[PDB]
A = this chain, B = another copy of it.
Amino acid sequence: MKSTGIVRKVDELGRVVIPIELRRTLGIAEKDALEIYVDDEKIILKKYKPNMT
């Protein structure tokens, strides 16, 4: 079980468990942020665009 059509549980309010490999891909964790967008019948969440100069 990795990604691409893999079933995960929610939590309560909405906190869905993102795969370690996925957050690893984004280089994010805990205190980091994601950019959540919506696509009709599904959710689209990218890592937040880091404003680092």
Contacts and interface: CB of A to CB of B under 8 A. Distances in A.
A7 B44 contact: no
Interface in A1-47: 3-20, 22-23, 25-26, 28-39, 41-47
What is the copy number of this chain in the assembly?
2
Contacts of A39: 44
Given A37-B5, A38-B3, A42-B47, A20 B13 contact: yes
Interface residues of A, number: 42
A35 B14 contact: no
B14 A19 contact: yes
B17 A43 contact: no
A39 B23 CA distance: 13
